[PDB]
């Protein structure tokens, strides 16, 4: 388990940490969401290439197919929250507190 | 006939691109089943030796498997030369 | 599978990629083909409870082949001890490992 | 007239000709005349590596024919 | 120096990863992702995954383009932030750089890191395997079998993406 | 014209591959000797490099199985030169 | 913590539309150079177009008062940079009407001759600069070679290339230089081809029509009420042309066809301009 | 002998765009009955040098509302991307024999648009943001057709290797088997490089700038030299992909001469259409691709997946 | 258009008031009406057909 | 049949302009190479040529003198260096040199 | 010699300047129409290296063609101040020079000089497209006689 | 090696041209030469407020469609299989849904750009 595995695993942790610390931006939040996807794609690519799991080389592709699909969903949701509330800071949508 | 011919002619006037694209799109699906060279394409792909033809141990009673590459018995693909 | 429709309906949907020793394209074997082949042939129908205790060394060989955890650890010790020994000056690499 | 346009092409055509000629000649010069061997697959690279080891001078392009064995 | 570019490339991947995870302005976040995405493509290329490397390069670039194409569309701030700007982003940024630089120091000085899992520093060149690939690249034939061995995956992926266009319009339509 | 030429290219590739199959036995035959030679050289050097260690019995198979496992490239070239490492691991990938 | 809404809908928040507003000039090359065109847009579709003008408000109407009738003649050449004799013809007719005096028949014929040449001048630049702003830059240069040819006729008769100061109350300054009519005939002989050169690359051009067809469409009564005149009435079905309804000078003797438009959009009026270019040749 | 090779590519490339600006006006002028530059040197053979030297000595200035860092890096992005993209082009023998050369050029060409809006966004100008937002959706929508057109044509290749086009169209030009895809490929190349049926990226008539909004002597020179280099290649890529040429393995000079001639002829056509058509409005150029190019694009794709199968003409993978 | 002049004299040798009818004045006054709904890139097209020379509107 | 005549006509210009050295002189200082009959010479050194076959506008031209009134004009030709008597003929205002 | 080296270097820069003037069209009045005739193929302004270019950030010389009305006078100064400044201003026509016909009006400044420094003055009403070509040629001569490096070497 | 040397040379060449771009031409600047350009008269204050364009729907479908082209990219190597019937059926299947998604996107306003 060489150091490149450490780099991208520790990377995904900061993607997890980055997502879980929304400061003032939904768009920057979605950035960290797609950020997670890099490390998962990159680690998955390293795994099935190292192990010569040739039939499983499709798995990183199918990750990406369902990757941007969420990415489109996030921005489409971001379209209306910014459209009808003006901005994208995740603090002005607290009307559901009650 | 009258309903179909009027529709095709009208679409051929206003939106030539769509009636065009639907044509080649339509032909792209139905000829490949009809055309007889599809089996040749399978045979050409099958006949391509990417891997080694690993020898199989001769314990006798294998008349069809050749003992030498130049032997007559076995899969011969002279049809490729003719085709 | 929770509700195994693949077993009942008798078709394959994902039981072709779940393992490394399946029919890969153009018979390209995986790295640890033999190691997992023994492991699966070891614990087949024996149950997960019995598999985790009986087919244990086969899994350990297979898991090691996947990561080379101990083998790389062995190589790490060879290089480190060689480095300090060469640096101190006891012995020098033989000419075959120079060119 | 229109033929006055051609000097604009000529100084460009010669300039665009250089990369094609330079790369073609550099490969031949740096590989002893023969074209640079292309390895699109590991098997091609395996031949090249065996060529480097066999030649003795650690040059893949330096080739030994029948005279190496006897 | 060319000992093994895997760690160096993955380091820039993490530093670029640190960037947009610190919550900059969204446009600067795209740059922080792109450098990580570009060098991430470099990591996979170095490991033999030639097709997959350029694959994530092309898709992501288009993906993140519409990302920060959107940010300037309706998510822009009238006074945009920057890597320095607010102390929060400044604090979030510098925290990431000092963090990763601590782990790599913790990584390269004993080579027996045991955080969560085990991580021993011996060189990612080692895990490579000796063997030819015939006249075909293994990765290309693996992802080519999607149309022969993965007909089930094609159906679910195709249907989901088709539904993906339905939801996008349906969500964004409104009224 | 494309149909005929592509068929000819397929026939050429068959000839190319058939040529490859002919020399595979030699390349396989020599390479196994080189790999065994490299491992043997590593084992002798490992014995010399560790003789005063507490317990490093020469050449213990980490895998419990007695069959041969295709060796790591690391354990082959590990103590060899830097140029040997780069030309071996990132040789085909970097050859552009 | 206030109670949740009864219909599960909150009142709409503060309006968040900013509607980016800019000034489209006067530096903009396609804004005629003197437009401070400010527009309101719904993001990209314009809502109102407030054309701030006065960026070239030279006090012409006040300066005319202080000059004599002859002294005020050059001002009308400097109102419309392209309609030179047409501008002076209007002022000359006004001064002659007050004076109850008519010009000699030769002077009238020269007026309508150079009046139609002028109509070629404005139409040439109107269409070509329309192509320039649209994006087609090539027909600009071809027909502005001919504009130089007509500029020679302006200079050969009056002395200056653009501001002729030629048409004056009571006729014209001086007679035509000998041999000018031959050059006018020579130039007009090939101008039919040059018009076909212009119109062939745009009239049927798919890009051109899509850039003008069904754009800027005005109705009939809308154009009449808005004070629109000239082509804009002609381009939208209204059959009106002062050259036929209220003939001035000897316009009651020349025969020509007014190109009434049908759709009223940009493309129809541009066609009317091109046809008005061809029709002037018959009048010439 | 690799630094010499690289500098035997960079210098000829920058000199090719250098005098393309002269063969632009000298061709544009002659097509609009003008004469083009013929004063600076004989026949204008020194005008671009006079242009270039001025554009590296007249005062550059960052905008007061600029973002310095992104303002400076955008010219770096444009120029380096343009140069690095010529790398796998298979002039007889390609400089870098990439196994996936086609995918490489697609990826980096999709990156040359980050320069245009990073320049636009950092410039903090109303015309800058408009031009930046015009260009991005312009290129990516034109990119969907770019990817599929390349794939449909290359299905007869059997691989993405650029060198194999030499072998593929050895006897027959590729355009004779994929001319319908050739037409949309040429139009898309006109659109990715922003020439002038769709030069709306600059939008000089309606946006005065947008390629380089406040960009000055140096940075303006880059954003020009980074797109005129794309002009030469996108026709070199068209030439290599569709109009093949005879390539004797012993005398590559004949192929280089032929290859250069096709690029020169194609580049003239890029200049030729530039002065023969009006400007597409934004919705029109988007409508043309999303509503007329794409339906034909997918249909001809399905044709080219099936075509080798029905005719048993699957090309060799190697 | 319909270029015209409202010339007012007083019996002297100079005009008393020379109002200049501007064909483009009413034309440019209607630009907002014609630009209703059309995209901004069509604003150049609907002033190109306008034929507004800016020495007449401004006078 | 006409290309060979064109090259011969183009080759004749080098003999027309006093040899090759004169040809580059006109090319590098007058930007034209067309030859034409010498209609006259003025006192300041300007050489006036005319060629009626050229279309109206280029049928007459002047090659400016190298030096006039203590100011070198080899590379510094000015449009006002024409004497009034020749200015009339040059501007096509009349046909009488 | 150092002076000789600075002499040739100055000439190289001055040649690069005078051989590429990019006017930023301030087309205001009938003076602009005649200037476009200079761009017309009859005189072909482009052939002299001088080609029309918008975006004053990418232009070298101003060509004031037409009357300068007091309302737009701030615009003239603003577009003048935004030029990367090896920069020159050419005034076309009597109106731009000193007011011309509208010298006595209430809303026309008596000359473009009062707003911007003015290089070569082009007289006319309008100056013929050939006269402007002579004017631009005069500016090229003025750029030729610039001793920027010689002055720096002798500071 | 070869690829990174080429990448390095390009960025150094580009950066050097910037360095001589901003340093060789000396500067005599002020606060009015750095003012944002707005075709003359003063800007009203913009270029960073939300500038909402209309092609957002088709901008995001490009991202969806760009994933389709990723899925159908491996086709050149997919033809080199022994079961082209299944490969042909699946290859056309992805194209059909890609066409179907565009067609349904077309019918419901879709490609039309909001006013
Ligand atoms: C990821 C790493 C990001 C690092 C960072 O802080 O970038 C800030 C950097 C600059 O932000 P900015 O909004 O331009 O503000 C610059 C000044 O604060 C505002 O403008 P300025 O005029 O003050 O700019 C000059 C200023 C800032 O320095 C510069 O402008 C020089 C270039 C950037 C240096 C950082 O100089 C100094 O502060 C003194 C330097 C000694 O923003 C970036 O996006 C650059 C990232 C570069 C990443 C690597 C690319 C290869
Ligand atoms: C609407 O539509 C529109 C368009 O179109 C659609 C348009 O077109 C246009 C454009 C307008 C026109 C065409 C109209 C006319 C205008 C013009 C012609 C403008 C002209 C503009 C120019 C930029 C001029 C271009 C002309 C020329 C002659 C350019 C010439 C080039 C050069 C002088 C430079 C050439 C390159 C050189 C010298 C490179 C030198 C390199 C080296 C010495 C080596 C460098 C590298 C190394 C040393 C590597 C080794 C180093 C190492 C390793 C360092 C390591 C370091 C470490 C720290 C490790 C517009 C505006 C438009 O509106
Ligand atoms: C990084 C920096 C690298 C620096 C490299 C060093 C050289 C760079 C610049 C080289 C050329 C500079 C100009 C030198 C000559 C000059 O001033 O010419 C204009 C000057 C301009 O003189 P002028 O000002 O009298 O011209 C205008 C006036 N009329 C038209 C009336 C004449 O002309 C000459 O010097 C004459 C030169 C004739 C030959 C020119 C070259 C012909 C062949 C070209 C082949 C292709 C080359 C590419
Ligand atoms: C490739 C190009 C080869 C030739 C390049 C020559 C150098 C041109 C640099 C730009 C002009 C300035 C220069 O040369 O020196 C700056 C020097 C700087 O010192 P300076 O004091 O003369 O600067 C001008 C005067 N002030 C400071 C008031 C603005 O300026 C000049 O030479 C201009 C006089
Ligand atoms: S000087 Fe004469 S031509 Fe020029 S703008 Fe003034 S009135 Fe018009």
UniProtKB/TrEMBL annotation, chain B:
Its main location: mitochondrion. The keyword Cytoplasm does not apply. Pfam families: NADHdh_A3. Residues 55-83 are annotated as: Disordered. Keywords: Acetylation, Electron transport, Membrane, Mitochondrion, Mitochondrion inner membrane, Respiratory chain, Transmembrane, Transmembrane helix, Transport. It is found in: Mitochondrion inner membrane. Complex I is composed of 45 different subunits. Belongs to the complex I NDUFA3 subunit family. This is NADH dehydrogenase [ubiquinone] 1 alpha subcomplex subunit 3. It comes from Sus scrofa (Pig).
From TrEMBL, chain D:
Complex I is composed of 45 different subunits. The chain crosses the membrane at residues 1-18. It comes from the Eukaryota. Belongs to the complex I NDUFA1 subunit family. This is NADH dehydrogenase [ubiquinone] 1 alpha subcomplex subunit 1. Accessory subunit of the mitochondrial membrane respiratory chain NADH dehydrogenase (Complex I), that is believed not to be involved in catalysis. Complex I functions in the transfer of electrons from NADH to the respiratory chain. The immediate electron acceptor for the enzyme is believed to be ubiquinone. It is found in: Mitochondrion inner membrane.
Automatic annotation (TrEMBL), chain F:
The keyword ATP-binding does not apply. Belongs to the complex I NDUFA13 subunit family. Its main location: mitochondrion. It comes from Sus scrofa. Complex I is composed of 45 different subunits. Interacts with CARD15, but not with CARD4. Interacts with STAT3, but not with STAT1, STAT2 and STAT5A. Interacts with OLFM4. The keyword Transit peptide does not apply. Keywords: Electron transport, Membrane, Mitochondrion, Mitochondrion inner membrane, Respiratory chain, Transmembrane, Transmembrane helix, Transport. It is found in: Mitochondrion inner membrane. It comes from the Eukaryota. Accessory subunit of the mitochondrial membrane respiratory chain NADH dehydrogenase (Complex I), that is believed not to be involved in catalysis. Complex I functions in the transfer of electrons from NADH to the respiratory chain. The immediate electron acceptor for the enzyme is believed to be ubiquinone. Involved in the interferon/all-trans-retinoic acid (IFN/RA) induced cell death. This apoptotic activity is inhibited by interaction with viral IRF1. Prevents the transactivation of STAT3 target genes. It is a single-pass membrane protein. The chain holds residues 49 to 144 of 144 of the full protein. This is NADH dehydrogenase [ubiquinone] 1 alpha subcomplex subunit 13. GO terms for cellular component: mitochondrial inner membrane; respiratory chain complex I.
Automatic annotation (TrEMBL), chain K:
This is NADH dehydrogenase [ubiquinone] iron-sulfur protein 7, mitochondrial. One of its GO terms (molecular function) is 4 iron, 4 sulfur cluster binding. Its cofactor is [4Fe-4S] cluster. It catalyses: a ubiquinone + NADH + 5 H(+)(in) = a ubiquinol + NAD(+) + 4 H(+)(out). Residues 30-139 form the NADH:ubiquinone oxidoreductase-like 20kDa subunit domain. The keyword Disulfide bond does not apply. Belongs to the complex I 20 kDa subunit family. Core subunit of respiratory chain NADH dehydrogenase (Complex I) which is composed of 45 different subunits. This is a component of the iron-sulfur (IP) fragment of the enzyme. [4Fe-4S] cluster binds at residues 30-31, 95, 125. NADPH binds at residue 155. Keywords: 4Fe-4S, Iron, Iron-sulfur, Metal-binding, NAD, Nucleotide-binding. Core subunit of the mitochondrial membrane respiratory chain NADH dehydrogenase (Complex I) which catalyzes electron transfer from NADH through the respiratory chain, using ubiquinone as an electron acceptor. Essential for the catalytic activity of complex I. It comes from the Eukaryota.
């Amino acid at each position: 388990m060489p150091l490149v595995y450490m780099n991208i695993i520790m990377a995904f942790a900061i993607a997890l940490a980055g997502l879980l610390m929304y400061r003032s931006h939904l768009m920057s939040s979605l950035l960290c969401l797609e950020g997670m996807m890099l490390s998962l794609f990159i680690m998955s690519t390293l795994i099935i290439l190292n192990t010569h799991f040739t039939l499983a080389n499709m798995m990183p592709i199918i990750l990406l197919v369902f990757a941007a699909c969420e990415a489109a969903l996030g921005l489409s949701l971001l379209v209306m929250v910014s459209n009808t509330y003006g901005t994208d800071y995740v603090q002005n949508l607290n009307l559901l507190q009650c | 006939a009258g309903r179909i011919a009027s529709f095709l002619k009208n679409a051929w006037a206003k939106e030539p691109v769509l009636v065009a694209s639907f044509a080649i799109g339509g032909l792209a699906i139905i000829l490949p089943s009809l055309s007889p060279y599809t089996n040749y394409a399978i045979r050409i792909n099958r006949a391509t030796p990417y891997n080694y033809p690993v020898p199989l141990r001769d314990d006798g009673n294998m008349p069809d498997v050749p003992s030498h590459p130049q032997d007559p018995q076995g899969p011969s693909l002279e049809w490729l030369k003719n085709l | 599978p929770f509700f195994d429709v693949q077993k009942r309906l008798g078709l394959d949907l994902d039981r072709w990629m779940t393992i490394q020793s399946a029919e890969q394209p153009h018979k390209i074997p995986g790295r640890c083909h033999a190691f997992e082949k023994e492991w699966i042939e070891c614990a087949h129908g024996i149950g997960g409870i019995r598999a985790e205790k009986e087919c244990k060394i086969e899994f350990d060989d297979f898991v090691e082949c996947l990561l080379r955890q101990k083998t790389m650890k062995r190589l790490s010790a060879i290089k480190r001890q060689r480095d300090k020994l060469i640096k101190e000056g006891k012995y020098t690499p033989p000419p075959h490992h120079l060119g | 007239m229109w033929f006055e346009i051609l000097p604009g092409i000529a100084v460009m055509a010669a300039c665009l000709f250089i990369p094609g000629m330079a790369t073609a000649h550099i490969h031949k010069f740096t590989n002893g005349g023969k074209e640079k061997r292309v390895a699109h697959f590991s098997y091609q690279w395996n031949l090249m590596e065996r060529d480097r080891c066999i030649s003795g001078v650690n040059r893949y392009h330096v080739t030994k024919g029948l005279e190496n064995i006897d | 120096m060319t000992m093994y570019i895997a760690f160096i490339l993955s380091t820039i991947f993490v530093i670029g990863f640190v960037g947009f995870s610190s919550k900059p302005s969204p446009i600067y976040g795209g740059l922080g992702l792109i450098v990580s995405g570009g060098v991430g493509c470099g990591i996979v290329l170095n490991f033999g995954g030639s097709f997959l490397g350029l694959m994530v390069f092309l898709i992501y670039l288009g993906g993140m383009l519409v990302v920060f194409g959107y940010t300037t569309a309706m998510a822009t701030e009238m006074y945009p932030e920057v890597w320095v700007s607010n102390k929060t982003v400044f604090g979030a940024f510098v925290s990431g750089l000092m963090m990763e630089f601590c782990m790599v120091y913790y990584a390269l000085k004993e080579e027996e890191v045991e955080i969560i899992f085990k991580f021993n520093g011996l060189g990612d060149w080692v895990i490579y395997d000796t063997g030819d690939s015939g006249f075909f690249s293994e990765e290309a034939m693996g992802i080519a079998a999607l149309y022969s061995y993965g007909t089930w995956l094609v159906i679910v992926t195709g249907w989901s993406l088709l539904i993906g266009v339905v939801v996008i319009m349906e969500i964004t339509r409104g009224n | 014209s494309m149909m005929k030429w592509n068929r000819e290219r397929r026939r050429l590739q068959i000839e190319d591959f058939e040529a490859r199959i002919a020399l595979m036995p030699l390349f396989q035959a020599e390479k196994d000797r080189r790999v065994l030679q490299m491992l043997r050289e590593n084992l002798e050097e490992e014995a010399i490099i560790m003789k005063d260690v507490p317990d490093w019995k020469v050449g213990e198979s980490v895998f419990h199985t007695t069959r041969w496992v295709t060796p790591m490239m690391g354990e082959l070239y590990g103590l060899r030169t830097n140029e040997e490492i780069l030309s071996a691991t990132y040789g085909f990938i970097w050859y552009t | 913590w206030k109670p949740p809404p009864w219909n599960d809908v909150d009142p709409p928040k503060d309006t968040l539309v900013s509607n980016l507003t800019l000034n489209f000039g006067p530096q903009h090359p396609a804004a005629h150079g003197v437009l401070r065109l400010v527009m309101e847009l719904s993001g990209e579709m314009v809502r109102k177009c407030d054309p701030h003008i006065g960026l070239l408000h030279r006090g012409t109407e006040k300066l005319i008062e202080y000059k004599t009738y002859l002294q005020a003649l050059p001002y009308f050449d400097r109102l419309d940079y392209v309609s030179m004799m047409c501008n002076e013809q209007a002022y000359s007719l006004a001064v002659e009407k007050l004076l109850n005096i008519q010009p000699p028949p030769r002077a009238q014929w020269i007026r309508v001759l150079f009046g139609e040449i002028t109509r070629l001048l404005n139409h040439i630049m109107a269409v070509t600069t329309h192509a320039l702003d649209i994006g087609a830059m090539t027909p600009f240069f071809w027909m502005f070679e001919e504009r130089e040819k007509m500029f020679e006729f302006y200079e050969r008769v009056s002395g200056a290339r653009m501001h002729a100061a030629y048409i004056r109350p009571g006729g014209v300054h001086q007679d035509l230089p000998l041999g000018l009519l031959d050059d006018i005939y020579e130039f007009s002989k090939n101008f039919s081809f040059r018009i076909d050169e212009l119109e062939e690359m745009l009239t049927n051009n798919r890009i051109w029509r899509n850039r003008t067809v069904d754009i800027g469409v005005v109705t009939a009564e809308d154009a009449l009420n808005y004070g629109f005149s000239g082509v804009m009435l002609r381009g939208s079905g209204i059959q009106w042309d002062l050259r036929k309804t209220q003939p001035y000078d000897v316009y009651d003797q020349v025969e020509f066809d007014v190109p009434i438009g049908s759709r009223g959009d940009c493309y129809d009026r541009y066609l009317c301009r091109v046809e008005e270019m061809r029709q002037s040749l018959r009048i010439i | 002998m690799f630094m010499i090779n690289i500098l035997s590519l960079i210098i000829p490339i920058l000199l090719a765009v250098a005098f393309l600006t002269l063969v632009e006006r000298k061709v544009l002028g002659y097509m609009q009955l003008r004469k083009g530059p013929n004063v600076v040197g004989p026949y204008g053979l020194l005008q671009p040098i006079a242009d270039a030297l001025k554009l590296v000595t007249k005062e550059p200035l960052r905008p007061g509302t600029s973002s310095i860092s992104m303002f400076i890096i955008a010219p770096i992005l444009g120029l380096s991307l343009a140069l690095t993209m010529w790398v796998p082009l298979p002039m007889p023998y390609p400089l870098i024999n990439m196994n996936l050369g086609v995918l490489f050029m697609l990826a980096m060409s999709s990156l040359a648009v980050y320069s245009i809006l990073w320049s636009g966004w950092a410039s903090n100008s109303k015309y800058a943001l408009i031009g930046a937002l015009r260009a991005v959706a312009q290129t990516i929508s034109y990119e969907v057709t770019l990817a599929i057109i390349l794939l449909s044509v290359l299905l007869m290749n059997g691989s993405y290797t650029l060198s194999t086009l030499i072998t593929t169209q050895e006897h027959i030009w590729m355009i004779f088997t994929s001319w319908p895809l050739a037409m949309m490929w040429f139009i898309s190349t006109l659109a990715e490089t922003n020439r002038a049926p769709f030069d709306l990226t600059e939008g000089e008539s309606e946006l005065v700038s947008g390629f380089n909004v406040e960009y000055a002597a140096g940075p303006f020179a880059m954003f020009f030299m980074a797109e005129y280099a794309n002009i030469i290649m996108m026709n070199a890529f068209t030439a290599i992909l569709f109009l093949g040429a005879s390539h004797d393995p012993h005398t590559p000079e004949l192929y280089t001469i032929n290859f250069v001639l096709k690029t020169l002829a194609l580049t003239i056509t890029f200049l030729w259409i530039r002065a023969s058509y009006p400007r597409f409005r934004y919705d029109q150029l988007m409508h043309l691709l999303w509503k007329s190019f794409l339906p034909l694009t997918l249909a001809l794709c399905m044709w080219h997946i099936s075509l080798p199968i029905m005719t048993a003409s699957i090309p060799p993978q190697s | 258009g319909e270029f015209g002049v409202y010339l007012v004299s007083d019996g002297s040798s100079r005009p008393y008031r020379c109002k200049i009818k501007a064909p483009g004045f009413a034309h440019l006054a209607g630009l907002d009406k014609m630009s209703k709904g059309h995209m901004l890139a069509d604003v150049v097209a609907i002033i190109g057909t306008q034929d507004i020379v800016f020495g007449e509107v401004d006078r | 049949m006409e290309l060979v005549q064109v090259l011969r006509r183009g080759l004749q210009q080098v003999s027309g302009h006093g040899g090759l050295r004169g040809y580059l002189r006109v090319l590098f200082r007058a930007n034209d190479v067309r030859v034409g009959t010498l209609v006259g010479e003025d006192k300041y050194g300007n050489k006036y040529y005319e060629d009626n076959k050229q279309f109206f506008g280029r049928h007459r031209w002047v090659i400016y003198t190298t030096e006039m009134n203590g100011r070198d004009t080899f590379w510094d030709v000015d449009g006002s260096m024409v004497p009034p008597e020749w200015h009339r003929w040059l501007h096509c205002m009349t046909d009488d040199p | 010699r150092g002076e000789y080296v600075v002499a040739k270097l100055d000439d190289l820069v001055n040649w690069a300047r005078r051989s590429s003037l990019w006017p930023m069209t301030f087309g205001l009045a009938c003076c602009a129409v005649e200037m476009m005739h200079m761009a017309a193929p009859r005189y072909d302004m482009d052939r002299f290296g001088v080609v029309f270019r918008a975006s004053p950030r990418q232009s070298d010389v101003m060509i004031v063609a037409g009357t300068l009305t007091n309302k737009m006078a701030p615009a003239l100064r603003k577009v003048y101040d935004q030029m990367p400044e090896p920069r020159y201003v050419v005034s076309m026509g009597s109106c731009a020079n000193g007011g011309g016909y509208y010298h006595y009006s209430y809303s026309v400044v008596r000359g473009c000089d009062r707003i911007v420094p003015v290089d070569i003055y082009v007289p006319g009403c309008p100056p013929t497209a050939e006269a402007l070509l002579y004017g631009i040629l005069q500016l090229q001569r003025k750029i030729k006689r610039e001793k920027r490096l010689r002055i720096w070497y002798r500071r | 090696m070869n690829i990174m040397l080429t990448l390095l040379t390009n960025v150094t060449l580009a950066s050097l041209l910037v360095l001589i771009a901003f340093w060789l031409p000396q500067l005599n600047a002020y606060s009015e030469k750095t003012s944002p350009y707005e075709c003359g008269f003063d800007p009203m204050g913009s270029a960073r407020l939300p500038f909402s364009m209309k092609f957002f729907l088709v901008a995001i479908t490009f991202l969806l469609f760009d994933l389709e082209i990723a899925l159908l990219l491996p086709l050149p190597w997919a033809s080199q299989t022994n079961n082209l019937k299944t490969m042909l059926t699946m290859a056309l299947f992805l194209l059909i849904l890609l066409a179907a998604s565009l067609a349904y996107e077309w019918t419901q306003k879709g490609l039309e750009w909001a006013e």
